[PDB]
Write a protein that binds this ligand. Structure first.
Ligand SMILES: CC(C)CN(C[C@@H](O)[C@H](Cc1ccccc1)NC(=O)O[C@H]1CO[C@H]2OCC[C@H]21)S(=O)(=O)c1ccc(N)cc1
Lengths: 99, 99
């Protein structure tokens, strides 16, 4: 598909029994999800942007479906205001910027 | 061009005869630049990112050439981790996400 940027590039993703809306975000190195109690091992991390840093939990090898495209990789979980699909998964679903 | 996402989508911009590197950021509504001088009137504003809110100076109708494509729009200047080109200007240069 092609997604214009007139509005926020929000798409439906699936992470377990949770369908959520997430931003396809070329400005994000990694995928950041709103607080959710995922199973499995994690590692503590801090990620920073405008306004400063937040504390997140990093989970590895998490399957996520993005617009019906399968992905699997690292996701961090914490008090973000929006779900963010970062480059680590955007590459997996074959996403490019074009102008 | 077509830009893949295995690396950060950093491009050269021209703003006031000055070349800067900036991040093409589909998750950003607004274009946010690091501390710099720009001519003309500005308005104090606040914007929120992943870590909280910051104060910025808002400049309207500023020309920027982004990777060889002309835009003229709102730029805000403040403490951002990196120069970001947001959707307000990405739309002007005809940028879309494709997968
Ligand atoms: C600032 C970037 C270098 C990095 N950010 C991604 C960015 O797209 C965020 C993504 C984002 C989006 C909404 C809320 C918080 C963060 N956008 C953002 O801060 O945009 C601001 C400028 O325009 C405004 O519109 C949206 C918020 C404002 S980030 O969210 O802080 C971020 C940082 C690190 C990782 N790993 C993942 C994401």
């Amino acid at each position: 598909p092609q997604i214009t940027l007139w509005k926020r590039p929000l798409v439906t993703i699936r992470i377990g029994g949770q369908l959520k809306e997430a931003l396809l975000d070329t400005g994000a190195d990694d995928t950041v999800l709103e607080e959710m109690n995922l199973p499995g091992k994690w590692k503590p991390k801090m990620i920073g942007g405008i306004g400063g840093f937040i504390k997140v939990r990093q989970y590895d090898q998490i399957p996520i479906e993005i617009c019906g495209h399968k992905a699997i990789g690292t996701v961090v979980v914490g008090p973000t205001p929006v779900n963010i699909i970062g480059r680590n998964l955007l590459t997996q679903i074959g996403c490019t910027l074009n102008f």
